[PDB]
Symmetry: C3
Subunit: 256 residues, 3 copies
């Protein structure tokens, strides 16, 4: 399809969604929400895609949101619209997703990055939750996902003060998978996406789903769910080919 | 008037300074009741938007009065629900800052973890040495420490009683920031001032949403936050904050 | 007893379980699972044991599993056996366990290490979750314990790419307790075990159980659990002696 705020690219088994509002420093709005989730969902249902990247510009992954949509928003309209709920569709994506974050990832932007499974950051990446300064708070999962990544003391710090966090701090805290030089961000993200998309598709979906369990229940239930999923893998051809390949000292030819 | 603490107000920030220097600010029952009383009074004061808790340069709080526990029987502890009063600190709705220098050991460390924001001096030494006394943490240590720095390190700290310096606390998830010892009180006031200057309802909601991350599934935490966020739009502070932003000025809440 | 795939030694109040499959880099398999859990269980019930070390060789804590064993498994075989469930027995051990990890700890090996309470890593340690490459996923708690230790973005990365993590990253990410020089792994692990085993046995077991609570319920419930366990500690002679010793400024003499 054609979109207005994003560009969508397919190369091999990798899909890439590039936020495209340069005049706004890739600020999120309701239209961006709708377009990204439509794109991501459409990519998720494509058998020829095994990984999805979401990225912005070198200057901004996403520097926040259009204040106009929130400025004269009333509680009635927010409640009626369930304002931001549509973002949940990105989390419902079963194929692995990778946020490639360069420069500014602030408010909504940082929240969008955290929605992704894998987070590769440029060395220029700046994260933060400055929503408090506008007299509000995170509304796209920030108080949940940030706190679960970096712990209470830092989560409370960023959310109550709005201070920024650079890439190196993001990396030692739990917020990002790894950090790479800014000129190599897109190349690294593609390489990570490539590797992931060459794994067995069900095994990757299963592995991602199992990790996601770790934030939804007791440890004891997470362990049970994982083990059962693990057992199910043995009904898949790819488990059989994967192990055979290992033993026979050769490359696995996955069928998906 | 208090015996074991000093309480001070300035603008919209309140400071509770632990005041038992002859005993390294070691916690006891009086300290528990006074700190929690002062914090609760500050929480109900609408002229207060942030609360600092700190000790001295040498020790935030080093352990506790052991004679208060030595001869306790199970029946005594159960009847008294020993340490339950500390729960009043976590119920404080206004943001709290632990400004930790020097020794934060046992209860001292647990008191620091109860606060929302933790600013440590470079001299801060954290530890859970309760095991050495033949008991364990009883003020949230096994729960808050583990959730901050992970199982491997919490197990290490709680079972060997080894201490952890400010740098390790910072890379592990225990403190928000580390600052030079001479700047601790200054920096915490700066952080407190900043928080106290935000919308009171907005910061209470933010804090409360963050606390949810430890009480339920992510699924439920996400829904709660989104509902809280929705409700913020029924506040006048929200209209002010966004209007102040457009006009590139400071909000007048 | 005597074992085929492991070695067991006892000194003072510390027990050591050494993985012993050098021909296969200590790769896990059903026998290792059964023997390791049997040994741990026996050490757990020995009153004269206060700490338990699990370790491998300097080249590998445990590099992967016998893929040969899982290769021809159908879903039915895995379902019937409840494949890997027996590992649960290790975490049911009440005495503190310490994983001393040198070299390779990949897949099941990394999962094994994470099951332990304390993890001492040699600077040569290499952690990974490469299960995905075989067209499966972590089956021994990897997706669960790794995620809880290092956070979502890093666990996703490891589990979805199979990349390795060195001891230094592991230490700053939350995965390990401490990193020491390779030549001193065993020495330092035994010092840590000696310290833990010299604590009150009951107090150590309680603190360990309290800590485990932090992954099984909400924070409010974990708080109440720990306070009540704390209350009951006052019914132990060790509480009474340990506090008396501290107050009397003398060394404690436990039971």
């Amino acid at each position: 399809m054609t979109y207005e705020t994003i560009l969508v690219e397919r190369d091999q088994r990798v899909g890439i969604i590039t936020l495209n509002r340069p005049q706004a420093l890739n600020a999120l709005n309701s239209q961006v929400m709708n377009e990204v989730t439509s794109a991501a969902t459409e990519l998720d249902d494509d058998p020829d895609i095994g990984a999805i990247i979401i990225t912005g510009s070198a200057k901004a992954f996403a520097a926040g949101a259009d204040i106009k949509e929130m400025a004269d928003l009333t509680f009635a309209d927010a409640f009626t619209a369930d304002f931001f709920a549509t973002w949940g569709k990105l989390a419902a994506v079963r194929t692995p997703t990778i946020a490639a974050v360069a420069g500014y990832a602030l408010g909504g932007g940082c929240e969008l990055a955290m929605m992704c499974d894998v987070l590769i950051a440029a060395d220029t990446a700046k994260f933060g939750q400055p929503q408090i300064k506008l007299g509000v708070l995170p509304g796209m999962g920030g108080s949940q996902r940030l706190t679960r990544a970096i712990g209470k003391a830092k989560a409370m710090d960023l959310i109550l003060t709005g201070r920024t966090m650079d890439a190196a701090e993001a990396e030692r805290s739990g917020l990002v998978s790894r950090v790479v030089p800014a000129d190599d961000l897109l190349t690294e993200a593609r390489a990570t996406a490539t590797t992931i998309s060459q794994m067995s598709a069900s095994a990757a979906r299963m592995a991602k789903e199992a990790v996601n369990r770790a934030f939804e229940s007791s440890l004891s239930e997470g362990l049970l769910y994982e083990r059962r999923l693990f057992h199910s893998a043995f009904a898949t051809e790819d488990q059989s080919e994967g192990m055979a390949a290992f033993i026979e000292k050769r490359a696995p030819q996955f069928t998906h």
